[PDB]
Amino acid sequence: KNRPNRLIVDEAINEDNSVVSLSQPKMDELQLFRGDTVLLKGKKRREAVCIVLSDDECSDEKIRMNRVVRNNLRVRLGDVISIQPCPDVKYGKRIHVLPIDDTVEGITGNLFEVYLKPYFLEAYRPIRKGDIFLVRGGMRAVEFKVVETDPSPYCIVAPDTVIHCEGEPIKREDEEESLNEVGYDDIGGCRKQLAQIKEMVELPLRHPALFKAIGVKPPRGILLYGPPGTGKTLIARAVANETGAFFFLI
Amino acid sequence: KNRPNRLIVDEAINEDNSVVSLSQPKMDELQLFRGDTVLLKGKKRREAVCIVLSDDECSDEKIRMNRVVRNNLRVRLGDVISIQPCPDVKYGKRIHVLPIDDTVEGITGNLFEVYLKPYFLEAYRPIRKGDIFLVRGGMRAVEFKVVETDPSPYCIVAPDTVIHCEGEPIKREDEEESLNEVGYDDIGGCRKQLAQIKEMVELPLRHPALFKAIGVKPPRGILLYGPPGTGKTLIARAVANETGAFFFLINGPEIMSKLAGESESNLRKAFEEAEKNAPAIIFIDELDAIAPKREKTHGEVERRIVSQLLTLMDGLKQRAHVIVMAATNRPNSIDPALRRFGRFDREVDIGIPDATGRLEILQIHTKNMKLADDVDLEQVANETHGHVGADLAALCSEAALQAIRKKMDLIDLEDETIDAEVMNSLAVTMDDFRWALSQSNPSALRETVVEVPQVTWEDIGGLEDVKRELQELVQYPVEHPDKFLKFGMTPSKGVLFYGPPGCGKTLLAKAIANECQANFISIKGPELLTMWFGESEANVREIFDKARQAAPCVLFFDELDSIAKARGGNIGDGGGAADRVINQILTEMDGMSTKKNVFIIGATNRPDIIDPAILRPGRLDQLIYIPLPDEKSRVAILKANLRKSPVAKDVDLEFLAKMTNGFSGADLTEICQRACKLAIRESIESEIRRERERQTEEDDPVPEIRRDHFEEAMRFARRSVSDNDIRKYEMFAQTLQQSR
Ligand SMILES: Nc1ncnc2c1ncn2[C@@H]1O[C@H](COP(=O)(O)OP(=O)(O)O)[C@@H](O)[C@H]1O
Ligand SMILES: Nc1ncnc2c1ncn2[C@@H]1O[C@H](COP(=O)(O)OP(=O)(O)O)[C@@H](O)[C@H]1O
Ligand SMILES: Nc1ncnc2c1ncn2[C@@H]1O[C@H](COP(=O)(O)OP(=O)(O)O)[C@@H](O)[C@H]1O
């Protein structure tokens, strides 16, 4: 559009899995409110709906996004997104959601009572078709994909609104990378070395054609070290998953 | 034509890529002017047009030519050229130039706007058909070939004249060697070893039929060495490209990876290939991987390949001008059977670069990076002690990547795709280099540095007679050998400075090593102690080996009494003054060459406990006593220390020298450093107080180190030598010089 409405995505710090946090300036400047719901459009015509918060630390051009919704938009870390305000709360009536067969196997139990009951309890969670969300509990982290929403194609669940959980779990799609995979959110005690590794492998992997178009030396060999079981292979797979580059393991 | 109009080409020093510089004499003598354009005819009926300049250093028969125009004439380095005057400026009208597809690929952008616009801006550049020129920018160096010129066949572009850049890039020709290849212009910090290598491989490669027509021994094996990533393979390819000799490259691990018997086939066939395409140069990279020492070889498969290499080296030296240059990290890490004559007889020590060399390396790698204006590579080159060429190359690339990473990638990430525009606009600030050099590069070497120290004679206050004696002892045997031979005297090869600590012994060593422009090797106390404790005195040999490899030199052992006082002082250990290390110093000093221009200097602030078997003739025998300064010298010391720091004008140094009596030369530096500390504290505190201004950002107060700052720095003055030590030195002098 070439006018300022696009933002750069980055890591998140909040424990809520269905919100996006933006800086107090960009909040007033984008003509938005605290708590107001919006649409986040990313790549491959896949948008979503989210809630906005305020965070002093995050900068203006930067937007906190946790891995679940960041993966939902089909975008990956370090890319650009378009935020559009939508105060059009089309309060839901019934949801048709089913789990995935891959994440749900052996799990003897009425999943409705055990997982979603405190999950959607007094939860004003907005949902749109094509959103694979997740909820944790019982030494498990279960994935749920919504197929059929009463308010088409998006809604917001009210505390009164029912949730309708009939059906068999569905086989996973070819264009969502599952969330049992590793990401930067998992690596706890190495947030400083992760800065170095991200700044080293950001440009060669995210922007490959750039180094084709420039005479400059890229970093080729990286030697991670440290005592065993510290998280080296973890960091490798995490970087591979976040930048989306193919990962061979020798 | 057999009359003087032909010249010898050689290297260039100017940064302009379309001119030739000639000596002021040959200028008047050839009937030419300064700036006048001429024709340069070379081989294969390919001439060019150029501009002439004046340069005092270049000699009469020699002509500065940079690699682009030198390659344009189809000639190579060391050949002869014909210069003809042509004041016929046939001022151009339109040019038809197109790039090469090889150099131009991926380069999204209007090349006309990004490269040629400031290139030909007010540029009176002469052009002729068949000229492939180049222009640098945007982390690229782009080649342009002219096909069709309005004034036929040559012209000169005026600032008014248009340049017409239509068409697709053309595929490169078979008889121009592309300029991404390496040449002598690229190698920065090895301009001295390059002289040796060029004089060694000039005649066998440039003039091959001459050695066929003469019975004389050619150099066959050359062993380049030095720490990794210093530029060995670079020098090899550079020599190969400049002399135009075929270059075969043998990689150590590559050959050593193949199966048993496949590797020897590869070596044999490689030598055959190089023999077939003579003149040739074989480069056996990482020789210490193929042929290590016999102790580290075990198993037939290794020794067999070493033997095969030996046999091939011995065989090649029958009627076959193939020079074999091999590279290794350390020379005493490879098989000693190789360094015997006929196989590897010439040895070259590349060594780590120095300050001027590092600055040159930086200029080489920032050649097309579009630096910012605040970039002062002097500071950088002064802060890169420990870096080799690979380190500096990676530093420049990392600074470039940081400049791409901060802005101009994420900023134009959302609006518009990649383009050449942003590449031109990237100015890499001095802060960026400060960051890249700050933490993100571990300097990859901590060896003994060999260089010509930057200390000069005015950096030292007082000690004039010691200066004339040092000049006499170091200079006269090299500058007037005939007097020494006539009078039969033998030139001494050693001095022993002695006196209070911190008075200028190391300063004098560096100064006299600088005045003669000879290398300097410092061997401090901790090193001798490390060789004594570790019980490895057999490293002393290696030290002297360096002094031989870098002749002329000044080998400087300071704190020579360190071992002598480590095992107790005057009484100390029950033994005598003979040590494990000092004995090796005696052995190596007695057994050096007759005159190899290596001048050993010692230093000791306790001359009574030094091993008296080193003060005997044939060894360090000139005892020079560095005394405590006087007022007329302390003034000079204070001036020489303070001349780098901005100091006020009302401060009287003569009063300081009056009050600071018997202060050793180090105390007069501690005073200045402490006063500078006080001034810096005041500056930062005033800065913070002016930052408490929140009522309204203004210029910092006058930073002249002022008086009444020394009045505080002087409060904490210490004398680092008692009168008792002065008395001891006095007694030493009195007894040893006057007793009987
Ligand atoms: N920094 C870390 N952050 C999160 N989990 C970790 C970390 N380090 C270790 N772990 C846990 O221990 C496992 C071991 O990690 P791994 O990459 O196999 O260690 P290494 O490769 O160093 O032997 C991880 O899979 C994870 O379960
Ligand atoms: N003396 C030098 N002059 C210019 N560039 C150098 C020099 N030394 C190293 N470099 C840079 O680092 C690279 C390493 O050179 P290389 O010949 O591979 O080192 P070595 O063979 O000693 O391991 C060169 O290609 C160049 O990019
Ligand atoms: N005569 C002098 N002239 C100039 N500077 C001196 C003089 N004497 C000592 N210094 C200062 O003392 C410092 C250390 O002196 P140094 O020569 O290392 O002592 P030593 O002679 O014991 O090796 C040097 O940085 C130098 O600036």
Closest residue in A to B138 (Cα–Cα): A214
Instruction: Say which of B107, B397, B440 has its CB closest to residue A217.
Output: B397
Measured CA to CA, the distance from residue A205 to residue A234 in angstroms comes to 18
Q: How far apart are the first and last CA of chain A?
A: 45
Q: How many CB atoms lie within 10 A of CB A31?
A: 8
Assigned token pair, A27: 């909040």
Strand partners, A140: A137
Tell me the C-alpha distance between A107 and A136, whole Å.
13
Which residues are CB-contacts of B563 (< 8 A; sequence separation ≥ 6)? B528, B529, B532, B579, B580, B581, B582
Task: Determine the Cα–Cα distance for residues B41 and B61; give it in Å rounded to an integer.
Answer: 16
Coil vs helix vs strand at B685: helix
Task: Measure the CA angle with vertex B584, ends B583 and B588; round to 5°.
Answer: 120
| Amino acid in position B450 | V
In this complex, which of A196, A212, A216 lies closest to B397 when CB atoms are compared? A216
Would you call B414 and A8 a contact, using CB atoms and an 8 Å cutoff? yes
Chain A residues lying within 8 Å of B393, measured CB to CB: 217
Rounded-to-integer distance, Cα B389 and Cα B228, Å: 10
B241 in helix, strand or coil?
helix
Interstrand relation of A62-65 and A19-22 (parallel, antiparallel or unpaired) = antiparallel
Single-letter residue type at B620: L
**Burial group, residue B430, by CB count within 10 angstroms (0-12, 13-18, 19+):** middle
A212 lies within 8 A of chain B by CB: yes
Beta-strand relationship, B154-156 and B126-128: antiparallel
Encoded tokens for B536: 């490895």
Query: Following CA atoms B431, B436, B439, B443 in sequence, which dihedral angle do they give, to the nearest 10 degrees?
Result: -130
Chain centroid, CA B550 distance in Å? 13
Using a CB-CB distance cutoff of 8 angstroms, which residues of chain B are in contact with residue A213? 106-108, 418
Contacts of A200 in chain B (CB under 8 A): none
Q: How far is CA B556 from CA B157, B526, B535, in A?
A: 59, 14, 22
- Nearest CA to B404 among B420, B376, B427, B386? B427
For residue B714, give how far its alpha carbon lies from the nearest alpha carbon of chain A (Å): 46
- C-alpha dihedral sign at B593, B599, B603, B609: positive
Give residue B667's identity as a one-letter amino acid code. Answer: D
Handedness of CA B674, B680, B683, B687 (dihedral sign): negative
Of residues B571, B599, B567, B591, the one with CA closest to residue B580: B567
CA dist list (Å): A6 to A58, A61, A89: 16, 8, 23
What span, in angstroms and rounded, lies between the C-alpha atoms of B402 and A78? 16
- Cα–Cα distance, B9 to B64 (Å, whole number): 7
Q: How many CB atoms lie within 10 A of CB A75?
A: 19
Q: Across the interface, do A213 and B108 touch by the CB < 8 Å criterion?
A: yes
Structure-solving method: cryo-EM
Interface membership of B104 toward A (CB under 8 Å): no
- The encoded tokens of residue A220 equal 């080729």
Q: Are the CB atoms for A154 and A126 separated by under 8 Å?
A: yes
Among partner residues A6, A196, A212, which is closest to B106 by beta-carbon distance?
A212
C-alpha–C-alpha distance, residues B568 and B470, integer Å: 33
| Alpha carbons within 13 A on the beta-carbon side of B246 | 13
Strand B494-498's sheet: what is its strand order?
A: B519-523, B553-557, B598-604, B494-498, B622-625
B247 touches B280 (CB < 8 A): yes
Quick check: B242 and B402 in contact, CB under 8 A? no
Nearest atom in ligand 3 to the alpha carbon of residue B497 is 21
Give CA–CA dist A119/B522, Å, rounded: 73
Q: Does a cis peptide bond (omega within 30 degrees of 0) precede residue A153?
A: yes
Residue with the smallest CA separation from ligand 2 atom 20 is B229
**Residue B303 contacts by C-beta under 8 Å, 6 or more apart in sequence?**
B294, B297
DSSP state of A221: -
Helices (H), ranges, B277-347: 287-290, 300-315
The two tokens of residue A205 are: 């992997």
Residue A133's nearest CA partner among A153, A160, A110, A103 is A103
Say whether residue A8 is in contact with chain B using an 8 A CB cutoff.
yes
The answer to whether B63 and B81 have CB atoms below 8 angstroms apart is yes
DSSP-derived 3-state class of residue B169: coil
